[PDB]
Amino acid sequence: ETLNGGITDMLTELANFEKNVSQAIHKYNAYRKAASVIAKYPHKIKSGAEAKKLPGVGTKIAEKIDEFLATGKLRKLEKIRQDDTSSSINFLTRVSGIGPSAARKFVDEGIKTLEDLRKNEDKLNHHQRIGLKYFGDFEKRIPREEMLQMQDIVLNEVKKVDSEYIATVCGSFRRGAESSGDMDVLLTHPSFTSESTKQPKLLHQVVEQLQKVHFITDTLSKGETKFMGVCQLPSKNDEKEYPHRRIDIRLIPKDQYYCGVLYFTGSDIFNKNMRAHALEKGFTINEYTIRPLGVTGVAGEPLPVDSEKDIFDYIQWKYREPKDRSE
DNA sequence: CATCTG
DNA sequence: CAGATG
Ligand SMILES: [Cu+2]
Ligand code: NA
């Protein structure tokens, strides 16, 4: 956690590049477990061999580690840090829709900065376009004061459309968060469950309303269940404009909302912690279900969930407030 | 994973 | 449809 960081840190840079700069998944994964494992290591490493004794730590890395030990750096690293292609690559990726693959490509072409992309827009896709348009907004986090407004809006319309819908902004916003990245929002409706063959309408139906009301600026992608799109909080008295924000929608069935309602809030650290206990109470969870465990190895069957409360008591737990969802 | 792209 | 992306 702090006694092996230089290294847990070096490797990590290495994995990202491998994953991004090269399309080296194999190598990438390689750094990946190796770090985290050195990461779990109780003592301070002072030799490459020391680590090599580890699982994941191969002679290559080993050597790498030594360089580090031997000198405050990694050349391959300082060499990476100053290559314009790689750096162009990593810059590029910042855009929405552009990814490693695209980067490389676009990099090949000679486009490497926010500047290039605008010239070469004809070659970007909607998402990519939208992504480049709101490079800045999308890079900034929404004040909960803003969260509170937007929601107020989601909720206002999600309702005016149909009394029966059950909106709910998930995330950190929920776990009290003063800032979020985007507004993610579970969606339900009684007439929406696990059996009931479809009903795309319910989703289209909202996405639509809000667009209609000028909340929703543009659509990233829109399916029969998910919904990725750009939105906006109406500027009041012209002098100040709201950043473009990234919003996501999702039509989940009744029979599995909270599952994903809780699941999605968090935390990453909490979910697991409750997940492990989920197990100790004769159960299992996943973003959608609180099943009972069969002793032969396994089995199942979705216990019926109607509150994030319901899931608690099942795994003999104190109903926790989304806040206390830190870990 | 659910969605877009070509 | 395989292959990106979020
Ligand atoms: Cu020790
Ligand atoms: Na090893």
Side-chain angles (χ1 to χ4, degrees):
Chain A
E1 280 176 296
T2 194
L3 79 181
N4 274 140
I7 294 151
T8 62
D9 332 325
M10 140 279 266
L11 274 50
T12 13
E13 243 175 276
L14 276 307
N16 269 328
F17 155 105
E18 290 316 349
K19 76 98 142 208
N20 293 171
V21 189
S22 338
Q23 161 211 140
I25 162 173
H26 296 303
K27 285 155 85 147
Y28 154 95
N29 272 134
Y31 296 99
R32 106 163 313 168
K33 73 327 191 231
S36 79
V37 324
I38 84 195
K40 275 183 287 167
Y41 198 50
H43 324 236
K44 200 157 215 97
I45 305 167
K46 326 287 271 276
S47 51
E50 203 192 318
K52 169 166 204 253
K53 312 177 187 259
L54 266 56
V57 200
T59 134
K60 302 199 280 159
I61 281 175
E63 211 192 346
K64 259 127 270 175
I65 272 181
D66 275 320
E67 186 170 3
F68 193 93
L69 269 34
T71 58
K73 286 270 223 163
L74 214 72
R75 170 176 153 183
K76 196 188 178 191
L77 215 41
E78 61 156 3
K79 154 150 190 149
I80 292 202
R81 307 212 200 96
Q82 47 91 178
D83 161 35
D84 100 319
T85 267
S86 132
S87 330
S88 290
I89 294 146
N90 291 138
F91 176 87
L92 259 23
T93 254
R94 260 162 90 223
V95 183
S96 212
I98 305 212
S101 97
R104 327 194 197 104
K105 189 193 89 224
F106 286 93
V107 156
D108 289 348
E109 311 225 79
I111 341 259
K112 348 194 193 184
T113 88
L114 265 182
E115 271 199 45
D116 294 348
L117 286 176
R118 306 189 204 93
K119 281 299 170 178
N120 316 298
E121 169 183 346
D122 24 294
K123 335 174 50 190
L124 307 170
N125 75 268
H126 185 241
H127 187 353
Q128 269 148 177
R129 293 188 161 153
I130 284 305
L132 157 70
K133 185 142 159 218
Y134 316 138
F135 181 92
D137 310 40
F138 298 168
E139 271 220 341
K140 299 173 200 84
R141 326 249 303 194
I142 334 155
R144 87 141 24 182
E145 19 272 275
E146 257 151 36
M147 277 293 160
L148 310 155
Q149 274 158 272
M150 296 185 273
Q151 194 196 233
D152 173 32
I153 327 161
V154 176
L155 321 165
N156 302 279
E157 319 282 350
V158 170
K159 198 175 145 92
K160 41 181 310 297
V161 76
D162 184 356
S163 219
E164 269 59 37
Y165 284 107
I166 291 135
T168 291
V169 177
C170 295
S172 65
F173 172 45
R174 231 163 141 285
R175 299 200 314 267
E178 261 203 53
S179 68
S180 328
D182 36 342
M183 148 152 307
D184 314 274
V185 186
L186 280 305
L187 205 53
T188 212
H189 193 272
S191 69
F192 192 49
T193 140
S194 252
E195 283 86 53
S196 64
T197 203
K198 285 314 144 186
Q199 209 210 315
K201 280 326 162 140
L202 322 145
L203 202 80
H204 298 268
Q205 279 201 159
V206 331
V207 184
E208 187 167 35
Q209 180 37 231
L210 304 38
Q211 289 184 213
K212 180 188 132 185
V213 317
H214 314 251
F215 186 41
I216 279 182
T217 57
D218 11 25
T219 286
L220 254 27
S221 30
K222 166 210 310 162
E224 83 180 353
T225 61
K226 207 152 176 200
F227 166 76
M228 290 169 342
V230 178
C231 72
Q232 191 193 12
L233 280 174
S235 290
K236 321 267 186 190
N237 19 180
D238 266 17
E239 273 290 0
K240 64 265 299 280
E241 191 167 298
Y242 284 97
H244 286 67
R245 300 142 146 19
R246 257 291 290 159
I247 135 151
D248 288 346
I249 316 203
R250 88 258 283 199
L251 181 41
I252 310 323
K254 180 65 214 185
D255 64 291
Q256 57 198 193
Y257 190 58
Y258 317 92
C259 280
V261 170
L262 173 104
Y263 160 71
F264 285 82
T265 258
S267 30
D268 309 17
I269 56 279
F270 165 107
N271 273 176
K272 306 161 186 166
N273 285 141
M274 195 173 171
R275 275 177 195 212
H277 176 110
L279 259 292
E280 309 303 316
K281 291 311 151 46
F283 311 112
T284 190
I285 9 282
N286 34 224
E287 38 291 266
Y288 342 85
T289 59
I290 180 140
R291 289 175 317 193
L293 213 35
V295 42
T296 65
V298 329
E301 202 78 350
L303 283 44
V305 180
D306 266 77
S307 194
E308 264 183 331
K309 191 26 215 158
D310 283 293
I311 311 179
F312 263 102
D313 340 338
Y314 299 137
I315 59 147
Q316 22 188 181
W317 259 41
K318 76 177 193 174
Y319 178 12
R320 282 174 144 210
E321 279 233 344
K323 155 277 257 272
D324 18 84
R325 304 287 191 64
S326 311
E327 36 100 18

